[PDB]
Amino acid sequence: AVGMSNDGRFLKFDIEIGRGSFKTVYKGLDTETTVEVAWCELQERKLTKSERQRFKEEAEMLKGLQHPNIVRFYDSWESTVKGKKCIVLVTELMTSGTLKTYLKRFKVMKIKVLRSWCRQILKGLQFLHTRTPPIIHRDLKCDNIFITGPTGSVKIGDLGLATLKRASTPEFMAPEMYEEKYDESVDVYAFGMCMLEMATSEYPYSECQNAAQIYRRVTSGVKPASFDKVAIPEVKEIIEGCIRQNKDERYSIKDLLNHAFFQEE
């Protein structure tokens, strides 16, 4: 009832599911399955053809991803209502909110939950990293890790959005990223900051008053003050391994998965 795939696969409805960054999520339907989906539009966007092709190629690889800890990506394309331009992404419908919304709601997390969810995130990342070629997310944060609800597992999401960003408050990022340098280890750094935020229910570097201060500290290897508040020894140890200044000296994902913390539960 308003939009439809060029084939006829997915339909769009007028129900809003919420907002991200002027990116509005409509409710949708996959007729081929009778499964409800997320119908995503980025309100007003466009760019160049090499960049366009780059998105198109990478996007096509997303459609072939199937993993329990990754949000399923269905399809994408550009459109112009009147009027307004946008990119449309169709993804698995996640209704049960994010880590970010969870933390904002409760402001505390049990250790058993943190262990299980952090393992799931690592398994997601390792799946992406060991595609051919590797997929680096490069924009991991609490507000694009989604909770399922059935089984209350987590999935990494906004793969389409991340691809767009890669094709070309915003934030702190690993030190190398300030020099637009990255490999797999940028996702490890982001993991570490996600785990810190889960363990403390604080946004890292909240003591800093401007980006510049954060830049200075991050590139210096000066840790956020919230690091000092972590109460669980093994969690603190894991976070420290992940947010080391030199990307080459950080824990690998294999290192992390093999940590005793995750052998506990």
Author numbering: 211 to 378, 386 to 482
From the paper:
With No Lysine (WNK) kinases are soluble intracelluar serine–threonine kinases noted for their unique active site and their association with familial hyperkalemic hypertension (FHHt). WNKs are the chloride-inhibited protein kinases long anticipated to control the activity of cation chloride cotransporters in response to osmotic stress. WNKs are activated by osmotic stress in cells and are inhibited by chloride. A model for WNK regulation, then, is the presence of a dimer–monomer equilibrium: the dimer is inactive and binds inhibitory ligands; the monomer is autophosphorylation-competent.
Here, we present crystallographic data that the osmolyte PEG400, when applied to crystals of uWNK1, induces de-dimerization and conformational changes. Remarkably, PEG400 induced a space group change from P1 to P21. Together with the space group change, uWNK1/SA in PEG400 monomerizes. No PEG400 was observed in uWNK1/SA/PEG400. Prominent changes occur in helix C and β5, with the largest change occurring in the Activation Loop (including the preceding 3/10 chloride-binding helix). Furthermore, PEG400 induces a large rotation in the 3/10 helix and neighboring helix C. The change in the 3/10 helix eliminates the chloride-binding site and gives rise to big conformational changes at K375 and E388 in the Activation Loop. The water network at the dimer interface, CWN2, is completely lost in PEG400 with the loss of the interface. Data presented here show that PEG400 applied to crystals of WNK1 rearranged and eliminated the AL-CL Cluster and the associated network of water molecules, CWN1. Comparison of the water structure in the inactive dimer versus the PEG400-induced conformation suggests that water functions as an inhibitor, binding and stabilizing an inactive WNK configuration.
